[model samples]
Target: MNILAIDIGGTMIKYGLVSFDGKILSTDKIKTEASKGLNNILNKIDNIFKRYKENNPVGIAVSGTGQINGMIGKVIGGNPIIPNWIGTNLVKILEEKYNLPIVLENDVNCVALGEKWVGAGKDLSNFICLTIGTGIGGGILLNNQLFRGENFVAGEFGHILIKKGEFEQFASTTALIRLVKERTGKTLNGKEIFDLEKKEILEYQEIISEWIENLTDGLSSIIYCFNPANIILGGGVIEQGEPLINRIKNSLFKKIGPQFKEKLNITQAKLGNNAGMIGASYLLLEKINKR
Candidate 1:
């Protein structure tokens, strides 16, 4: 059987057709164009599925930032980019329009599941996948299952309170930008902020250090709480590569001590952008097996 997978991001929407063997038959992507609202995007998706109707026995996987109740198939909450998505009954709408089985999960959860099935975390039974980009997002897989805690908001690692009133309030990309502006009286984009780190600017280092320290603190809490076997790091920031990964690892090791730290393995995510859509395809298989 074949399944249709869709991964919705702030900037783009990607979809693909995958066979049970995890081979993608066809795939495509387009700008999300959130200004058009939820209905417009849904209509576009419906039209795409219609064009691919030859592939029978289909299923869908949706990944994005929102309060997704996968069991009931609902998305609540709206990110800055996608405004009209809040309170959208995505599952019901898709099912009614296409008459196929559908599954909806937060984008990060889909990435974790995808990694567990065929990406970086494939060999591990318990691990955490962190997508560090415009914002840090995370998902956890334990005992071969995606752990979406009650209310479907279990792995929001980025927003987790790392420091009292300070880091939590201003430490993400937005926070970093503000800090740079306050110090240099000039604004820097996310990439520029990261680039400044490479240049070894003392001021930039201080900002990055604080962010990394807070990140490690948050990660340490996860380590203490779940004791995951491995932590897979992805997203745009991770693409900067080793320096960031090593820093995080070293900081985390210092915080947790060698004993518990030895058990933790940190690695870069292998699947990259394809992780979400590929994982969404697997969700169809999950739904099938559960029945």
Candidate 2:
């Protein structure tokens, strides 16, 4: 089925027109202002889909923040980052307007599904996927099937308890930026903040280093609890590549120790920023296949 797939995040919305054969035909993105509320977000989605309607999309696939039930096609648990985002009934609105098949899932779950379809986790049967952007959202795959858990709030890793507090408060790029700004009295984007330790690292390196440790500490719980075959990471900050990944690996082994290290296979997400959109496409593909 040709699908119009959407990925809604706290800061941005990404959408694409994709063909039945897995080709992404057209892609677009827009900024999200949660302060504007749910109606604003809905209007934006409607506008984004209007142009693609000419393509004769068979279905709409979506990935988003908060607790989403693809079967019910509703965002049940409100996302605090996107104020008043919880009560939104995404599937009903889109279906009522377009009369097409629609599927929705938590954004990070889409990240994992996209990875399973064509990214880093393709060969793995079981693993956890983490997207550290505005927050630390996660997805779980058990026996190669997406695990939604009993409450549909399974991969809410950002709220995971860690030493200092929540996982995202320290590990996410937003957290890093906040940390940098709060202490240094200067604002820096995620890349600029992460790049501080690049190469030799003349100064302010501990800020980044400690953040990495905090991230690892939170992840250590995942490794110990899930014992997943792999842990795949995705986000803008991870694009720093080996410099950051290697450091995390080093810290993980030291903290998690040799026993856990041998079973661990930590890696970066290969899909980059396109993960959620592509994953939504895959979700549509699955629904189409079933029907």
Candidate 3:
């Protein structure tokens, strides 16, 4: 039986059946409806579990919001995105009800693991994976192992200060949208704004250039601290592909010195939405295989 992998975010819960070797067999998503509270969220998860239980999945793997205690599948520290989520122990609750093992990881950390397993970082040992969507969250890999830091909250990259403001305020997709609205009197999502730029709209081009400048201002700081071999950029903006990557690369070229630029790789996330599920599956496969 395949593993059931779930990625829980503020807006959606994406789940999939993944094979032992990281193939995503099938996938689907459900609205999180987070305002409904914790029990409602649990019910949704239980329903998905029931639907798949007959297939006898070896275990359930989760990529979830907040600071995760992956060793025990508990939530330690995180935003109040979901009420009563802080103390919930997913592994204990799910294993007791379903009689199967479960592995839980922070969503960003899962992103890194997924990339390491079969995505952008598969062949690289040192890299940072940044998911720059509504906000930027990242995972650091050093010598092929995730560096969770002392509190398991180490990769909160967006909060880093670049100039006088927190990085995400100036660098996130949400920031870009706000920028577009502020300058163009047009409200658009990240993709729509990028589409305007793709059409070579001069005003959109200027806005994007400004956004990329804000992005690299923070990124250059990160590169200095980690000196990562590769920087894997995730989230919807990555769909823009080479144009986006080239822009960031060119911006970085201006910010950092030649020594820092040498052999630095900036690539887009290859797995898209399937990353979290496949990543969570990697955690499950590791646990069950070792046992």
The 10 consecutive residues of candidate 2 with the worst lDDT sum are 195-204
Name the candidate that leads on lDDT: 3
For each candidate in the order shown, give its overall lDDT on alpha carbons: 0.78, 0.83, 0.89
Candidate 3: stretches off by over 4 Å: none
RMSD of 2: 1.9
lDDT (tens digit, per residue) of candidate 3 on 79-144: 888888888899988899889889889999999999999999889888999998889999898988
| TM-score ranking, high to low | 3, 2, 1
Error of 1 at 269 (Å): 1.3
Candidate 2, residues 192-245: lDDT per residue as tens digits?
776565654654586888889989999998888887768999988898877678
User: Which lDDT tens digits does candidate 1 get at residues 1-291?
Assistant: 787888888778888787786666788888888777787688768766876777785677677667687676678653645656878778888888777888887888888888888889888988989877666678888788888887788887766667644333454566667678888898888778888888898998998787677778877877888887699998766776677789888888888966678777899898888888777777767876868
User: Candidate 2 has which clashing residue pairs, if any?
Assistant: 78-86
The 10 consecutive residues of candidate 3 with the worst lDDT sum are 235-244
The candidate 1 region of ten consecutive residues with least summed lDDT is: 164-173
Angstrom error at residue 69, model 3: 1.8
* TM-score result, candidate 2: 0.93
Ranking by lDDT: 3, 2, 1
